[PDB]
């Protein structure tokens, strides 16, 4: 419940299905440790990355790999990786939605952060 | 010139060229009155809409004829047109740049106000 | 189920609660007829505007009035109305989400259009 | 100059001034190599990053130090920095303009490619 990633295609007005998502957390030594991963559903969303027990304060990186999405559309992408880096839970637990909007020459990302 | 409009196409990664733009100003009876109109240049820009003297404080609406633009490129888009409203306060001379970024199912608009 | 409007605040990373939403449909005579209305919930979303029986093909306008949201934040907005106009159901029934992202000097809107 | 970066602040409706920008180029071993860096001017622009000869085909990452920018304005933002990737193909001379629009919880990036 506390972390959900959503990916949308601005050209098609559609969810982006089968986008690979990787989450890393910055460790003590300043390296990126693996945290969680998954693939977006039919609705362009990925739920169940983590639990409130595991999603502690820290610096997180969310990566998306869109190759499979673009190729399913018959598109040969010129690049296919996007990353965002943020601080989480630093004023207490919140629920986070990280949304990306894709097009060929533009990219947006927005975070919505709510209470219970 | 105190008012410029700039339009960008996120599908082509290009200025949006020859796009029709209409600017309206809210009248005292709450109707939108025509103010100026034009078509974007080869750089995606439209200047010469107003002199400094004609550009008074008020609530302005910029309407961008995205429908015709996308259809001319063989694309059937979502919106009939793109619209943004912006307010000009009274001030010393200020330049207002209205920037739109277009995709077939999404757009974003920003008003940049600078003291020249 | 077929039409949902969502409004988000990009400054705060939050849903925009109590935003008034009005939907109009273009009639035979080219006037805008009232269609539906409501207010966004805690989650920034408004569901239950219409039913598949009523949401027929046509040209629709979705208006938002953000005054109550901004004033609750202690903000005195310089304008507080946004509109989008689109064609619906023209290739068969779809579900539509119309999302707006607000900030003081920018505005985005995106439509996501899916099947069952 | 064939590469320019432009950064806009959606909270203030202004160019984002004195913002640090780093540009990296992907190397043959898949690492990001430093390419150039600078700070935005009073118009929100950064030019002089590269000569035409140094700007070869490749995959480029533009990192914008949004964290420091927002903190300097008294705002605690979501992202540690903003990142966009763009690819340059081999071609006749082309100008690449990378445009970012910043809010504390959202940003959008676009690559505009023009034939001068
Ligand atoms: Re991508
Ligand atoms: Re404004
Ligand atoms: Re608004
Ligand atoms: Re690109």
UniProtKB/Swiss-Prot annotation, chains A, B, C, D:
Purpose: Thyroid hormone-binding protein. Probably transports thyroxine from the bloodstream to the brain.
Name of the protein in its database record: Transthyretin
Outcome of substituting residue 38 to V: In AMYLD1; amyloid polyneuropathy with carpal tunnel syndrome
Consequence of substituting residue 27 to P: In AMYLD1; amyloid polyneuropathy
An annotated GO cellular component: extracellular exosome
Effect of mutating residue 75 to N: In AMYLD1; vitrous amyloid
Locations listed in the record: Secreted; Cytoplasm
Species whose genome carries this gene: Homo sapiens (Human)
Modified residues (Sulfocysteine): 1
Underlying gene: TTR
Recorded consequence of changing residue 41 to R: In AMYLD1; amyloid polyneuropathy
Glycosylated residues in this chain: 89
Domain of life of the source: Eukaryota
Effect of residue 110 to M: In Chicago variant
Resulting phenotype, residue 26 to N: In AMYLD1; amyloid polyneuropathy
Impact noted for substituting residue 36 to D: In AMYLD1; amyloid cardiomyopathy
PTM (free text): Not glycosylated under normal conditions. Following unfolding, caused for example by variant AMYLD1 'Gly-38', the cryptic Asn-89 site is exposed and glycosylated by STT3B-containing OST complex, leading to its degradation by the ER-associated degradation (ERAD) pathway.
Domain comment (free text): Each monomer has two 4-stranded beta sheets and the shape of a prolate ellipsoid. Antiparallel beta-sheet interactions link monomers into dimers. A short loop from each monomer forms the main dimer-dimer interaction. These two pairs of loops separate the opposed, convex beta-sheets of the dimers to form an internal channel.
Subunit composition and interactions: Homotetramer. Dimer of dimers. In the homotetramer, subunits assemble around a central channel that can accommodate two ligand molecules. Interacts with RBP4.
Effect listed in the UniProt record for changing residue 9 to E: In AMYLD1; amyloid polyneuropathy
Involvement in disease: Amyloidosis, hereditary systemic 1: A form of hereditary systemic amyloidosis, a disorder characterized by amyloid deposition in multiple tissues resulting in a wide clinical spectrum. AMYLD1 is an autosomal dominant form due to transthyretin amyloid deposition. Protein fibrils can form in different tissues leading to amyloid polyneuropathies, amyloidotic cardiomyopathy, carpal tunnel syndrome, systemic senile amyloidosis. The disease includes leptomeningeal amyloidosis that is characterized by primary involvement of the central nervous system. Hyperthyroxinemia, dystransthyretinemic: A condition characterized by elevation of total and free thyroxine in healthy, euthyroid persons without detectable binding protein abnormalities.
Family per similarity comment: Belongs to the transthyretin family.
Residues of the full protein shown: 30 to 145 of 147
């Amino acid at each position: 419940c506390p972390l959900m990633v959503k990916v949308l295609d601005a050209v098609r007005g559609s969810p982006a299905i089968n986008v690979a998502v990787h989450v890393f957390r910055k460790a003590a030594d300043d390296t990126w440790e693996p945290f969680a991963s998954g693939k977006t559903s039919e609705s362009g969303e990925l739920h169940g990355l983590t639990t409130e027990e595991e999603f502690v304060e820290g610096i997180y990186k969310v990566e998306i790999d869109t190759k499979s999405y673009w190729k399913a559309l018959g598109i040969s992408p010129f690049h296919e990786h996007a990353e965002v880096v943020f601080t989480a839970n630093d004023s207490g637990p919140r629920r986070y939605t990280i949304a990306a909007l894709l097009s060929p020459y533009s990219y947006s990302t927005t975070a919505v952060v709510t209470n219970p």
